[PDB]
């Protein structure tokens with residue numbers, strides 16, 4: 057207070073609190089005036105602090121709680137005590153606290169900046185930390201929270217973070233904690249450089265600042281979020297619109313950011329404060345394209361929309377400089393050339409237009425008729441719909457893609473310079489051209505992204521990265537790297553040089569697992585043609601070759617391999633003699649469920665139609681179960697020779713195998729039936745749960761014995777316990793309720809959520825597996841979390857890398873685990889001894 | 890079907906690609922105003938796949954019930970990315986909402 061009273065200190069009175077500060081120059085003065093006393097001060101307060109509270113003890117309840125995390129490393133660094141800085145920051149406890157109190161971006165920034173501060177070995181370690189930290193930032197700031205300590209165990213063996221955490225895990229006794237060792241961790245996960253998730257809602261547009269300093273993104277959350285490209289630290293939180301923000305872009309100087317949205321308003325915000333600077337609104341429909349002039353010389357704003365008009369706005373004015381009309385369809389995209397005098401417009405109608413901004417008059421029109429495809433289709437030649445429209449380095453040419461081909465148009469001659477054919481024959485939905493190596497990134501369709509070298513006209517690599525449909529792809533301001541963003545709202549940073557390389561590291565999502573007693577085999581669709589049956593725990597990759605099968609099934613006692621196809625017909629190949637095979641044509645749509653009878657012969661199959669095929673292969677006899685239901689949803693062989701099947705009709709019928717004979721006929725639901733399960737033991741009981749309630753039955757009566765009405769929000773799935781006496785059901789939100797199968801009751805709702813204190817489950821559940829003990833219920837979904845039957849959880853540990861685990865396949869030893877996430881990453885897990 | 894339950898389903902699973910009101914803009918998918926009684930792929934100003942445009946059926950309660958259960962099966966080659974709605978009741982509710990919302 058005296059310092060303030062002497063002009064030596066400034067005071068921001070935060071209500072009842074007094075946050076003291078210095079101005080920039082006021083700090084600079086002492087910075088120079090003071091010498092080595094400063095390092096002594098740095099070292100002093102380190103010891104003194106530890107004499108009072110430990111930096112890890114340091115709880116968020118303190119006033120100085122974040123102080124020491126924001127500055128202690130700074131003190132040690134300034135002090136040039138690299139041994140103390142090493143001891144401080146190479147710590148999962150330090151990281152944990154700092155990331156729960158302050159956040160991970162500053163931390164990462166330090167591990168980077170301190171690379172020139174630390175010793176050689178230390179830098180090598182810190183680099184392990186630089187990669188380590190890419191693992192988190194997913195759970196940080198959200199629930200559940202990551203256990204930074206255990207997170208270390210996910211690092212490569214090579215990594216110091218792993219070796220430290222793993223040795224420490226070995227040092228720390230009996231910690232029930234339970235960890236799994238991922239055996240082929242080293243062969244799987246093509247880890248991208250950076251994972252960014254900027255919005256809780258759908259992301260619609262994102263881009264780099266001209267400076268390359270920051271990234272702006274906007275979307276369905278109705279706001280503008282801008283964050284530092286280096287650290288990810290959020291810079292601007294601007295509640296830009298009252299409706300979903302369709303696109304947004306930087307001005308020349310990065311001094312303004314304009315957003316254009318569903319509300320049909322064009323708003324230019326000061327990037328500094330986020331206050332409205334200019335606002336424009338003439339379009340009738342929602343605005344599709346907004347782009348600033350590139351050069352600072354002319355100040356024009358181009359917009360275009362679904363209303364098929366273009367509007368040239370004078371940034372100097374509040375009004376439109378000129379309304380430009382002339383497209384025949386809706387306008388999809390628009391870009392200023394580097395030459396501020398030319399504006400290129402791209403639209404649905406397959407024309408490129410060149411507009412002279414000086415006169416606001418149409419200069420030339422390019423009719424993109426260069427894709428020539430004469431189909432049998434009586435209609436005229438394949439109409440060309442131009443999509444991505446990007447400028448060449450020159451600015452005189454536009455690289456566009458449409459249909460099956462990439463075209464290079466010269467805006468000055470309106471002629472065609474290049475023509476590249478792309479992958480097969482589909483329609484290119486999104487694309488962009490790389491400034492280097494004449495590469496082009498073509499997101500063809502259904503998140504298939506192909507990297508091609510134009511001019512060379514040769515495919516370079518299959519870019520895998522997202523399960524969901526890729527929404528946008530854009531290049532770093534250097535052009536040295538680029539990032540992809542999909543519907544999974546995950547931005548993944550990729551190094552172009554790495555993308556150009558081929559890789560077997562990750563698998564396709566279509567995988568399955570067969571445990572053969574002592575050994576485990578993983579069935580996985582091959583990168584290209586058919587599939588590889590990979591015997592795990594050995595190299596033995598056995599590639600099978602074919603016309604590209606859709607699914608496979610092993611017969612009892614093996615000796616036969618069966619596979620389905622889009623044609624619906626199934627072919628069974630004898631394994632004793634690979635020249636003998638049988639196939640009897642049936643089914644219109646792709647075949648669905650495939651399963652052999654109890655015996656090694658006779659194959660039962662179903663599809664989209666109303667009948668279940670009993671195919672007595674070798675004789676090719678077709679006996680049909682004429683259910684005459686809308687569609688056979690699925691079926692499963694029961695223990696006796698009975699056959700359990702259901703449709704979406706809300707019906708569950710019980711047939712005989714071999715010879716169709718619907719002995720029992722249950723009508724359980726009013727709608728879609730999603731699966732059905734059996735009591736396992738014998739088959740005394742069997743039940744259902746689907747978009748309604750969970751009814752259970754004994755088969756003897758045609759009607760169900762009891763209806764579990766517990767969930768009003770409609771039950772989604774269910775599964776019997778392994779013989780015990782329990783029936784678990786899953787709710788819309790993944791709430792798992794355990795019911796006791798004794799005619800029917802109201803048993804506990806165990807669904808541990810919260811809950812970062814130890815990890816909330818993420819929500820929803822994709823699979824259930826009761827422990828052999830009958831005491832725990834393993835729940836799988838975002839990740840695997842062990843719950844306790846009736847109240848409580850258990851192993852809170854082992855966070856999976858990806859999400860949406862599909863089918864958990866537990867080894868019969870209940871010692872190893874094989875599963876697959878949404879990324880197609882193969883989990884080969886062995887319980888850590 | 891229950892119109893209110895269908896509205897929730899639409900908002901949750903369709904709205905991001907479709908508008909239902911008259912004059913509603915096309916998005917990833919076509920505006921659906923006037924859907925009932927119209928043939929496939931006829932909304933003006935939207936680039937449908939030839940598969941869609943050639944299906945040749947008329948949209949109504951029955952055709953929608955089948956299409957929404959499995960879009961790709963009913964119209965092979967469609968560019969509509971949606972797995973389908975398994976539950977009969979949910980499709981009934983959604984269709985009831987569409988019958989109202991695309992006609993107001």
Ligand code: HEM
Nearest residue numbers: 902903906917918929930931937938941967968969970971
């Ligand atoms: C359950 C929700 C949805 C319903 C009820 C629905 C319904 C429809 C209908 C009836 C059509 C045909 C329109 C016509 O012929 O005029 C259609 C087309 C289309 N929908 Fe959806 N849709 C839904 C969700 C989606 C979603 C989530 C996407 C996008 C990811 C989508 C993308 C499309 C596209 C791209 C077309 C045009 C397809 C083509 O030309 O082949 N729809 N939708």
